[PDB]
Design a protein around this ligand. Structure first.
Ligand SMILES: COC(=O)c1ccc(Cl)c(NC(=O)c2cc3cnc(OC)nc3[nH]c2=O)c1
Length: 344
């Protein structure tokens, strides 16, 4: 495969120590998703470490990363301090028939952070800071001459700048597109996937806000809010919390009948089944998941500072505005930043 340079998966067979182009000194592998791999490497020419995202040697994979690069370059050259919430693409190049993107090295991602605490969750204060950054990040992406949809927000694609501080950056625009230049129907990671996408409807930037909604709850509770094993499970878990999606949406949804049934009288219910598996629609209240009046998630924050019922009621209000079923009334970043959960 690729004159012995690649494994059977179209991935470059990384070798520690290797020096590419009399410049980069590959130390090791540090990331390996569906896109390919990410390695740690010393840039001799600039005297710094970098992360190198090695794209899979495969036409569909390369072609998509070419889109990542057009969008990364567009974000990076935009003069506004908000652009510092999106990671910096220093260079790209072809090497051994792989596209390679050279990035500033960042630190652990938010998933690693959750794991570091044994999934007890991070503080409501910390979560606030992440949320605050994310919404400013999304606000940047929403600027008209950008209008970029990330499409795969989740803890693993949000990284700490430095391991002991709380500045973060969004990475992985490998599934991103601009408004009106949509090309996939199946997108986002399942846990973080919006209802409009599960329903096969057209989507806009509001899908990132759904994802953020779910992420922030997870960051605080330490477990995914909606953890479906497949699309049918996913939509049922959402329903447990928010009830049946409103009729105006289902009526225009190609995949409505993958999960739902229209009744003679025009209302919608879940599909008939053989058999109890889910809580009744809307009876798994975000109010209890978060532990608003019971000392937070699991009771784990009972009488700690920064975790008042009033903090939680604010928080909860934001999340539910983020998980609005309707993409046209779901809270957009501008207004989310004005939310009272961010007062001082
Ligand atoms: C899919 O990932 C991407 O598109 C992407 C795009 C751009 C970047 Cl800068 C990355 N960065 C990393 O993966 C990365 C992984 C690390 C793992 N471990 C550690 O130990 C502290 N530090 C890391 N620092 C990193 O920057 C990833």
């Amino acid at each position: 495969y690729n004159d012995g340079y690649d494994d059977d998966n179209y991935d470059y067979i990384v070798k520690n120590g290797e020096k590419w182009m009399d410049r980069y000194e590959i130390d090791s592998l540090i990331g390996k998703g569906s896109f390919g791999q990410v390695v740690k490497a010393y840039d001799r020419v600039e005297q710094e470490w970098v992360a190198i995202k090695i794209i899979k040697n495969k036409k569909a994979f390369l072609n998509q990363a070419q889109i990542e690069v057009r969008l990364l370059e567009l974000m990076n050259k935009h003069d506004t301090e908000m652009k510092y919430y999106i990671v910096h693409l220093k260079r790209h190049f072809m090497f051994r028939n792989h596209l390679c993107l050279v990035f500033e090295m960042l630190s652990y991602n938010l998933y690693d952070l959750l794991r570091n605490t044994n999934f007890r969750g991070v503080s409501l204060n910390l979560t606030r800071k992440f949320a605050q950054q994310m919404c400013t990040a999304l606000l940047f992406l929403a600027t008209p001459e950008l209008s970029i949809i990330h499409c795969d927000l989740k803890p693993e694609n949000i990284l700490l700048c430095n391991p002991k501080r709380s500045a973060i950056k969004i990475v992985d625009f490998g599934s991103s597109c601009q408004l009106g230049q949509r090309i996939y129907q199946y997108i986002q990671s399942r846990f973080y996937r919006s209802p409009e996408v599960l329903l096969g409807m057209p989507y806009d930037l509001a899908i990132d806000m759904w994802s953020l909604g779910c992420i922030l709850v997870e960051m605080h509770t330490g477990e995914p809010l909606f953890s479906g094993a497949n699309e049918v499970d996913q939509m049922n878990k959402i329903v447990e919390v928010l009830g049946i999606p409103p009729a105006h949406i289902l009526d225009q949804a190609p995949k409505a009948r993958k999960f739902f049934e229209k009744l003679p009288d025009g209302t919608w219910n879940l599909k008939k089944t053989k058999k109890r598996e889910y809580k009744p629609p809307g009876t798994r209240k975000l109010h209890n998941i978060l532990g608003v009046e019971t000392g937070g998630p699991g009771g784990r924050r009972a009488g700690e500072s920064g975790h008042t019922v009033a903090d939680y009621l604010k928080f909860k209000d934001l999340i539910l505005r983020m998980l609005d079923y309707d993409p046209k009334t779901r809270i957009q970043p501008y207004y989310a930043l004005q939310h009272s959960f961010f007062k001082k």
